[PDB]
Enzyme design. Structure first.
Site, short mmCIF file in Angstrom:
data_model
loop_
_atom_site.label_atom_id
_atom_site.label_comp_id
_atom_site.label_asym_id
_atom_site.label_seq_id
_atom_site.Cartn_x
_atom_site.Cartn_y
_atom_site.Cartn_z
N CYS A 183 -7.07 16.68 13.06
CA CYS A 183 -7.78 16.84 11.80
C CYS A 183 -7.82 18.32 11.42
CB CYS A 183 -9.21 16.29 11.89
SG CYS A 183 -10.15 16.22 10.30
N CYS A 197 -14.77 8.39 10.24
CA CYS A 197 -14.15 9.56 9.66
C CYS A 197 -15.18 10.67 9.42
CB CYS A 197 -13.51 9.18 8.31
SG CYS A 197 -12.25 10.32 7.70
N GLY A 248 0.82 -1.21 0.00
CA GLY A 248 0.00 0.00 0.00
C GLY A 248 0.86 1.26 0.00
N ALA A 249 0.75 2.06 -1.06
CA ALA A 249 1.47 3.33 -1.15
C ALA A 249 0.57 4.54 -0.84
CB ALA A 249 2.15 3.49 -2.53
N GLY A 250 0.15 4.65 0.42
CA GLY A 250 -0.74 5.71 0.86
C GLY A 250 -0.08 6.61 1.88
N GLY A 271 0.48 6.16 5.08
CA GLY A 271 1.48 5.44 5.86
C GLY A 271 2.53 4.76 5.00
N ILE A 298 -4.60 2.90 8.86
CA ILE A 298 -5.99 2.51 9.09
C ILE A 298 -6.15 0.99 9.14
CG2 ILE A 298 -8.26 2.36 7.93
CD1 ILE A 298 -7.94 5.32 7.24
N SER A 333 -2.32 -4.67 -7.63
CA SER A 333 -3.04 -5.03 -6.42
C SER A 333 -2.66 -6.45 -5.95
CB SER A 333 -4.54 -4.94 -6.67
OG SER A 333 -5.27 -5.25 -5.50
N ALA A 334 -2.43 -6.61 -4.65
CA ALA A 334 -2.30 -7.94 -4.05
C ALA A 334 -3.69 -8.55 -3.92
CB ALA A 334 -1.65 -7.85 -2.68
C1 LIG Z 1 -11.88 12.30 2.87
C2 LIG Z 1 -10.83 12.09 3.96
C3 LIG Z 1 -10.20 13.23 4.57
C4 LIG Z 1 -9.17 13.03 5.58
N1 LIG Z 1 -8.55 14.18 6.18
C5 LIG Z 1 -7.51 13.97 7.18
C6 LIG Z 1 -6.82 15.12 7.84
O1 LIG Z 1 -7.12 16.45 7.53
N2 LIG Z 1 -5.80 14.86 8.81
C7 LIG Z 1 -5.45 13.53 9.15
O2 LIG Z 1 -4.41 13.25 10.07
N3 LIG Z 1 -6.12 12.44 8.52
C8 LIG Z 1 -7.16 12.70 7.53
N4 LIG Z 1 -7.80 11.55 6.97
C9 LIG Z 1 -7.56 10.27 7.66
C10 LIG Z 1 -6.23 9.62 7.19
O3 LIG Z 1 -5.21 10.09 7.56
C11 LIG Z 1 -6.29 9.08 5.73
O4 LIG Z 1 -7.40 8.27 5.46
C12 LIG Z 1 -4.95 8.47 5.22
O5 LIG Z 1 -4.77 8.56 3.83
C13 LIG Z 1 -4.85 7.00 5.70
O6 LIG Z 1 -3.55 6.47 5.66
P1 LIG Z 1 -3.36 4.87 5.26
O7 LIG Z 1 -1.79 4.70 4.83
O8 LIG Z 1 -3.68 3.99 6.46
O9 LIG Z 1 -4.49 4.47 4.11
P2 LIG Z 1 -4.45 5.08 2.57
O10 LIG Z 1 -3.88 6.48 2.49
O11 LIG Z 1 -5.95 4.90 1.92
O12 LIG Z 1 -3.38 4.16 1.71
C14 LIG Z 1 -3.79 2.84 1.54
C15 LIG Z 1 -3.16 2.37 0.24
O13 LIG Z 1 -2.88 0.94 0.07
C16 LIG Z 1 -3.57 0.54 -1.14
N5 LIG Z 1 -4.26 -0.74 -1.30
C17 LIG Z 1 -5.45 -1.12 -0.73
N6 LIG Z 1 -5.60 -2.51 -0.97
C18 LIG Z 1 -4.45 -2.96 -1.68
C19 LIG Z 1 -4.07 -4.23 -2.18
N7 LIG Z 1 -4.95 -5.37 -2.00
N8 LIG Z 1 -2.91 -4.36 -2.83
C20 LIG Z 1 -2.07 -3.26 -3.02
N9 LIG Z 1 -2.43 -2.02 -2.53
C21 LIG Z 1 -3.62 -1.89 -1.87
C22 LIG Z 1 -4.30 1.75 -1.72
O14 LIG Z 1 -4.63 1.85 -3.08
C23 LIG Z 1 -3.60 2.92 -1.12
O15 LIG Z 1 -2.58 3.52 -1.86
C24 LIG Z 1 -8.81 11.73 5.96
C25 LIG Z 1 -9.45 10.58 5.36
C26 LIG Z 1 -10.47 10.79 4.34
C27 LIG Z 1 -11.16 9.58 3.66
C1 LIG Z 2 -11.25 19.59 11.14
C2 LIG Z 2 -12.11 19.14 12.26
C3 LIG Z 2 -13.52 18.77 11.92
C4 LIG Z 2 -14.46 19.92 11.64
C5 LIG Z 2 -14.81 20.16 10.17
C6 LIG Z 2 -16.06 20.99 9.88
C7 LIG Z 2 -15.95 22.50 9.97
C8 LIG Z 2 -17.25 23.28 10.17
C9 LIG Z 2 -17.14 24.76 10.28
C10 LIG Z 2 -18.11 25.50 11.21
C11 LIG Z 2 -17.72 26.91 11.64
C12 LIG Z 2 -18.73 28.03 11.38
O1 LIG Z 2 -18.92 28.97 12.39
C13 LIG Z 2 -17.89 29.80 12.75
O2 LIG Z 2 -17.42 29.41 14.01
C14 LIG Z 2 -16.34 30.31 14.51
C15 LIG Z 2 -15.92 29.81 15.83
O3 LIG Z 2 -16.86 29.89 16.89
C16 LIG Z 2 -16.77 31.75 14.56
O4 LIG Z 2 -15.58 32.57 14.78
C17 LIG Z 2 -15.46 33.01 16.09
O5 LIG Z 2 -14.23 32.41 16.72
C18 LIG Z 2 -13.07 32.71 15.95
C19 LIG Z 2 -11.87 32.01 16.46
O6 LIG Z 2 -12.06 30.69 16.89
C20 LIG Z 2 -12.89 34.21 15.80
O7 LIG Z 2 -11.85 34.46 14.87
C21 LIG Z 2 -14.14 34.86 15.32
O8 LIG Z 2 -13.97 36.28 15.31
C22 LIG Z 2 -15.33 34.48 16.10
O9 LIG Z 2 -16.52 35.09 15.58
C23 LIG Z 2 -17.45 32.19 13.38
O10 LIG Z 2 -18.20 33.39 13.64
C24 LIG Z 2 -18.40 31.21 12.78
O11 LIG Z 2 -18.67 31.59 11.44
S LIG Z 3 -12.66 13.65 11.79
#
Ligand SMILES: Cc1cc2nc3c(=O)[nH]c(=O)nc-3n(C[C@H](O)[C@H](O)[C@H](O)COP(=O)(O)OP(=O)(O)OC[C@H]3O[C@@H](n4cnc5c(N)ncnc54)[C@H](O)[C@@H]3O)c2cc1C
Ligand SMILES: CCCCCCCCCCCCO[C@@H]1O[C@H](CO)[C@@H](O[C@H]2O[C@H](CO)[C@@H](O)[C@H](O)[C@H]2O)[C@H](O)[C@H]1O
Ligand SMILES: [S]
Ligand SMILES: Cc1cc2nc3c(=O)[nH]c(=O)nc-3n(C[C@H](O)[C@H](O)[C@H](O)COP(=O)(O)OP(=O)(O)OC[C@H]3O[C@@H](n4cnc5c(N)ncnc54)[C@H](O)[C@@H]3O)c2cc1C
Ligand SMILES: CCCCCCCCCCCCO[C@@H]1O[C@H](CO)[C@@H](O[C@H]2O[C@H](CO)[C@@H](O)[C@H](O)[C@H]2O)[C@H](O)[C@H]1O
Ligand SMILES: CCCCCCCCCCC1=C(C)C(=O)C(OC)=C(OC)C1=O
Ligand SMILES: CCCCCCCCCCC1=C(C)C(=O)C(OC)=C(OC)C1=O
Ligand SMILES: [S]
Lengths: 421, 421
Positions: A359, A163, A11-13, A15, A305, A80-81
């Site tokens: 996140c 997630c 898996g080249a993701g 991790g 994961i 793929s494996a």
């Molecule tokens: C939409 C989304 C947003 C996310 N945002 C964040 C974030 O902001 N911050 C954070 O810390 N984490 C985030 N994550 C969580 C996380 O970090 C990721 O899902 C991350 O890519 C997972 O790492 P991984 O190496 O375990 O899996 P993956 O990155 O999915 O890598 C798995 C890999 O192995 C491969 N594979 C699968 N089966 C096989 C097989 N049978 N043979 C060969 N290869 C195979 C794949 O094709 C792939 O390349 C997010 C996840 C999702 C889905």
């Molecule tokens: C990554 C983790 C997972 C979450 C992903 C989803 C994100 C959703 C976004 C919702 C935010 C919308 O609502 C928003 O909240 C912030 C925080 O209270 C408010 O912002 C408030 O706090 C921030 C700082 O924290 C100040 O800079 C700001 O002046 C104040 O008004 C905004 O007025 C409002 O617009």
């Molecule tokens: S998350």
């Protein structure tokens, strides 16, 4: 071979790519490092929601792997494996060739379990996905079709999802993009459906004021929100939703028409891995010790994961806790250290460290982010942040991580904490 | 002396105590380390608000210094420096004895400039202080007298203050303690007066949602709040307050009766230090380079509140940015490294690193905390947090820091980030 072990990284993701570089770095020219993955390209997963609404292009977040790992002495098989024989230590590839290994590091990520909800597969109906770049491109395409012929939108997370952040991110940027296009008022209804017991639970019992801020966020955008939900099926362009109470009893059922939808699916282990007898829990996740080593096979390690992590809570509708980037990198680092120690007489003592979740979500001009550790409350760090600076930070990390994947990793990644000196 | 330098550390406070231990550790038995301080005891300053409302006792947060530093080979003189002759490198003590030094590290903290506001000295009227344990004990005493004879309360921060957090902390815990005693409704008026241009500016242009959360906090407690204020005098048990606009023009004047008050004063440099010709800016703060070395005298270093830091903003009423613990420890560490390098031929290259501010406040069951860096926005980290866990964290740090001051420091303090492994 004897004295020149073959170490395979599956898996080249997130991790697996770093694991290949760190493995080769740690082992040197005396051993053989091979990376095997389903796709010939790397993708930056956290950018997928933006692709799904059209704020990013595949070419921005994805690149071909071969040249970058090969220039580093790593073999790359873009295949793929399909089967792993842990007794004979042979991997059978899609094409039918088999690859022998002395050590195997599994980094195969999640299987997206659309099969849990009949009709939910992005190719079977209106409910799309932003978990992969293939799916996000498809989701945007469906988004454009929604624009041409406005109708109800439904976004959220399925039963068993782990997630949740990306669901909220996607809903917010869809709402934003609708406004930016002046199309927002053509939408009949915009609903948020989640398996969380409350808004902003995030699979981690909430973090900072994630509850109040995500709740108010959705309201601000005129998005109607339901919790403790599970989707039983998608059919005839309708989502059949069952809502329960704290005791898991039905308090109502709903039938929601969907012109455009996106639900985060539950994750399971991939079939080739789940299929190894005695390797995995019933979900298909590799059972490992604190050193990332399989409890069944001494020469099998796992990271990301793909590994199993015990639940700390049991919610009315099944939910899971996310496995995120910083912890994944600690897993990778531990595995590489301990495999190397194995190749040198020592038993590696390195561990993943303290559980944590981190996140980042970008809404366009500003972002939201959280840090939680350890898993159970009261925590040592429990923080939620929002602001322009979070947006600037996600932007910076994406560009950094991607460059790093092209250039190589020879140090502990998160020396990113050099912004202190 | 030649080949066995005498290194003097002036002030046994948050920077100076660790500096003594780290200096002795770094230098070894070949050199002489002497700590000189006005008081014979160390006190944990962030605990002073709690003493001021009676939630803590002096004996909890303070201890005698002599034995702890002496067992480590450090000389301790419990005497105030009255004069420093930088040319002759002699310090004249209160008792009239003089101490020669080869290197001087100034860690004398702030002079509390009550003289800026006639009548504001805690011994001159009803406006008290929680900056020192002597003052906090006095403040509690006055608090009890308020209980016996209820009257208006006024809490806040003066023009030129740089330390705003403790003002908010104190007001909140006073409000809380009043309730816990069932005395809250006997108070005629409870006012918050600050030199900040808005609530939660904190001398750092705000951090996270400090503005919204501190604003709502004060309202919740029925505390009336005024910003852009300066107190011109305290007299006849009345506080004379002038409120300005963005252009520094008077928009109103107020006369507030005070039965019990506490205003954070502006900080200046202490007289013995400020009095060294060419050493300090007009405020009495030591002008240093990035290596913590005086710009005038090569054998004089400085750390903590004592050093000068350029303003990044100019508010309608003068305010300053705080100098807090993590940055102070980096200053100390840098100074010790560079003095040692000087004693060994090298020019020390170590610096303080990136500007940052970190503050914790405990309200009883839960706390508030922030991290901001660097100084100017948009920041790399800009976070505000609240919760039970922040309270548990302040509790833990106090007990840790205090034990550390009794046991010794031989490593980089904030290896406190071992809660990751
Ligand atoms: C939409 C989304 C947003 C996310 N945002 C964040 C974030 O902001 N911050 C954070 O810390 N984490 C985030 N994550 C969580 C996380 O970090 C990721 O899902 C991350 O890519 C997972 O790492 P991984 O190496 O375990 O899996 P993956 O990155 O999915 O890598 C798995 C890999 O192995 C491969 N594979 C699968 N089966 C096989 C097989 N049978 N043979 C060969 N290869 C195979 C794949 O094709 C792939 O390349 C997010 C996840 C999702 C889905
Ligand atoms: C990554 C983790 C997972 C979450 C992903 C989803 C994100 C959703 C976004 C919702 C935010 C919308 O609502 C928003 O909240 C912030 C925080 O209270 C408010 O912002 C408030 O706090 C921030 C700082 O924290 C100040 O800079 C700001 O002046 C104040 O008004 C905004 O007025 C409002 O617009
Ligand atoms: S998350
Ligand atoms: C009420 C309050 C709450 C605070 N809370 C926090 C917090 O939660 N987190 C944080 O990071 N920071 C906090 N701070 C800010 C800061 O960290 C402290 O003020 C800290 O104690 C300052 O370190 P210092 O070594 O520079 O000065 P100090 O700790 O005041 O030490 C200065 C010392 O030198 C001495 N001295 C002065 N003149 C002479 C002389 N002429 N001769 C000999 N000795 C002399 C003193 O008696 C004293 O021991 C708080 C400050 C205050 C006032
Ligand atoms: C140390 C830095 C300087 C500041 C010192 C002064 C502290 C002043 C304290 C004011 C806080 C009072 O107001 C308090 O704010 C928090 C945060 O929005 C609210 O708490 C809210 O967010 C927190 C997490 O951040 C959640 O756990 C909580 O469920 C939610 O309601 C409380 O409902 C409210 O009671
Ligand atoms: C566990 C204790 C705190 C960890 C430190 C977090 C800050 C450093 C980078 C974090 C990060 C950012 C900014 C980020 O944008 C991101 O999304 C891709 C992550 O996931 C992989 C991150 O881990
Ligand atoms: C500059 C980047 C972030 C620094 C790390 C902060 C967390 C570690 C301890 C912080 C701290 C706590 C908990 C604290 O309670 C406290 O009050 C006494 C401080 O001031 C000295 C602190 O610095
Ligand atoms: S502060």
């Amino acid at each position: 071979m004897r004295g020149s072990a073959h170490v395979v990284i599956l898996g080249a993701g997130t991790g697996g790519m770093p694991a290949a570089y760190e493995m080769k770095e740690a082992l040197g020219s005396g051993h053989e490092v091979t990376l095997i993955s389903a796709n010939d390209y790397f993708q930056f997963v956290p950018s997928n929601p933006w692709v799904g609404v059209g704020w990013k292009e595949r070419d921005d977040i994805a690149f071909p792997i071969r040249h970058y790992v090969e220039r580093k002495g790593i073999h790359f098989i873009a295949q793929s494996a399909e089967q792993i024989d842990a007794e004979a230590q042979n991997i059978t590839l899609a094409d039918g060739n088999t690859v022998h290994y002395d050590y195997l590091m599994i980094a195969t990520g999640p299987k997206l379990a659309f099969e849990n909800v009949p009709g939910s597969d992005p190719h079977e109906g209106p409910v799309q996905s932003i978990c992969t770049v293939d799916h996000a491109e498809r989701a945007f395409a469906e988004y454009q079709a929604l624009l041409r012929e406005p109708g109800p939108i439904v976004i959220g997370a399925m039963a068993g999802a782990s997630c949740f952040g990306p669901a909220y991110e996607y809903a917010m940027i869809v709402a934003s993009d609708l406004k930016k296009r002046g199309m927002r008022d053509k939408i009949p209804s915009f609903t948020f459906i989640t398996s969380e017991p409350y808004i902003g639970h995030l699979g981690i019992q909430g973090v900072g004021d994630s509850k109040g801020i995500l709740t108010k966020g959705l309201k601000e955008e005129g998005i109607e929100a339901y919790t403790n939900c599970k989707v039983t099926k998608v059919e005839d362009n309708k989502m059949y939703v069952t809502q329960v109470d704290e005791k898991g009893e039905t308090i109502k059922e709903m039938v929601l028409p969907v012109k455009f939808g996106m639900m985060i699916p539950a994750f399971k282990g991939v079939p080739a891995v789940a299929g190894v007898e005695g390797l995995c829990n019933p979900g298909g996740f590799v059972l490992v010790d604190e050193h990332q080593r399989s409890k069944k096979y001494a020469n099998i390690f796992a990271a990301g994961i793909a590994i199993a992590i015990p639940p700390v809570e049991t919610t009315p509708v099944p939910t899971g806790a996310p496995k995120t980037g910083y912890m994944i990198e600690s897993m990778v680092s531990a595995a590489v250290h301990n495999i190397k120690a194995d190749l040198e007489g020592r038993k590696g003592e390195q561990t993943m460290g303290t559980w944590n979740a981190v996140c980042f979500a970008d809404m366009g001009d500003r972002g939201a982010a959280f840090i939680a550790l350890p898993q159970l409350k009261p925590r040592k760090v429990d923080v939620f942040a929002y602001g322009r600076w979070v947006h600037l930070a996600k932007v910076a990390f994406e560009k950094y991580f991607i460059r790093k994947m092209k250039m190589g990793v020879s140090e502990p990644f998160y020396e990113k904490v050099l912004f202190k000196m």
